[model samples]
Target chain A: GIVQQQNNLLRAIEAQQHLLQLTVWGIKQLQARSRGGWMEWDREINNYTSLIHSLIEESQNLQ
Target chain B: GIVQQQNNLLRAIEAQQHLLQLTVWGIKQLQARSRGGWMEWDREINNYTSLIHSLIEESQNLQ
Candidate 1:
């Protein structure tokens, strides 16, 4: 649950950041492969970005 | 705390997958309708599948 499960909120945000990074990496990989479908990655990127934004916003809310 | 938080994660995953599946159905519909956005749907499919994989991996790590 902590991403790293360090019981720290900032650490959790860092994990979300990692996820976003992975998403970007995954997108690049898929694109490089000349994948038949690009929108799938696009939507995922959209969803992950939103998720990351939500987490950042929540952390702010807690403050 | 883990339960509620886990529940939230489960809900998010489920909702996202549900949307992904629906997007697939949508692609089929679009295919039938001669629409032009299969790539969009494909990106979503990839995203959800990747997410599901990540969640599964995370679940295993929790044990």
Candidate 2:
């Protein structure tokens, strides 16, 4: 029942976490190499932040 | 100016695409083993759907 769903949820969370780590690192690189186009990167960072929040919300919903 | 950000956005999109593929596969597995508690998974699927849409939107935003 809920057990299977919960199990699936945990796996999903792990996947999201892994991707987020990579995404954040990429953003940091963009920041460091911000010779120009910082604004676009900033917007992408904002999008990622929103995505992360949504993921966290989903995790909570799973519980 | 925007070139660096565009480069970073492309990388981010690739990472998101990979994660999305994994997420979709996991969801399919969950669907196949639908013993019970399908609601939670259904919700998660919706969440991922939204996330995918957001990723697409961000990709467009990068342009």
Candidate 3:
């Protein structure tokens, strides 16, 4: 049961990883293309990247 | 320092809430308008919603 549940966790983590990659790609494009406007939004985007990484770390720790 | 970090976290959570709402809206549109396509992507979208809620709950618990 634990193994089954662990795999379930793994699947959930994998799904999160997929979503994070997509978000990171979009953020990277924004980082590259931004022209000195929207500094607050940029800061928030950076925060999101950090939070996504932190969540991924938490998921990994579960394994 | 703890207060500062907690504030940072709250800011991060707010940013996430903004992002999650956008994604949820997009996902809702997809779910509503799908033409019997991309079922797997739909499931992944749902998973992302759950994972995001989980993250928000975790952050709230920290508060």
Candidate 4:
């Protein structure tokens, strides 16, 4: 079972892809606006990046 | 129809939040010594990002 395909992990990974795409919109919104969207996205991106980075680091040692 | 639309909207947003949290874990894994764990994550993030963006944009045009 250890070597078996991790369906849940695979799906979870797929879900993460969807999340980043959402962030892309957040980025596009920034590009459209001078400050309103971009500033909000900038803060949001950093916040997300920080949270993601930590989780990734943890997952690194999981398997 | 309006109520149904609103309910679907809520579900999509919830899914988006879940994906975002997964992205954070993927990001953290990248900082570790092994890029192996994160590689699967990086591609996954980009894929999810693109898919979710189109979906959201389409939804925007809807409402």
Q: All candidates' lDDT scores?
A: 0.53, 0.55, 0.57, 0.51
lDDT of 3 by residue, B9-58 (tens): 55655575567558656644544642344466556666776776675555
Candidate 4, residues B1-63, lDDT tens digits: the string is 654654465456547656575645644543442223335545665676666555554444444
Worst 10 residues of 1 chain B by lDDT: B29-38
**Which of the two candidates, 2 or 4, achieves a greater lDDT against the reference?**
2
The digit string of per-residue lDDT tens for model 2 on A1-63 reads 334434443444454555454445433543453356578867877797788778777867766
Model 4 TM-score on a 0 to 1 scale: 0.35
> Candidate 3 chain A: worst 10 consecutive residues by lDDT?
A1-10
**lDDT string, candidate 3, A15-49, tens digits:** 55566555444444444543567688768867877
* Tens digit of per-residue lDDT, candidate 1, span A1-63: 544332233433444454445446544543554465777767877797888779777866665
Best-to-worst TM-score order? 3, 1, 2, 4
DockQ of candidate 3 is 0.07
Candidate 4 residues A4-60, lDDT tens each? 222223334445544665446443533453344357757877787778766665655
Number of backbone-clashing residue pairs for each candidate, in the order shown? 6, 0, 0, 13
Ranking of all candidate structures by their lDDT, best first: 3, 2, 1, 4
Span of 10 residues, lowest total lDDT, candidate 3 chain B = B29-38
DockQ of every candidate: 0.05, 0.03, 0.07, 0.10
Per-residue lDDT over B1-63 for candidate 2, one digit per residue giving the tens place of the 0 to 100 score? 455655564566556567766655654564454334446545655565565556555544534
Where model 4 places Cα greater than 4 Å from the true spot, the runs are A1-7, A14-26, A33-37, B1-14, B17-63
By DockQ, the best candidate is 4
Query: What is candidate 1's TM-score for chain B alone?
Result: 0.48
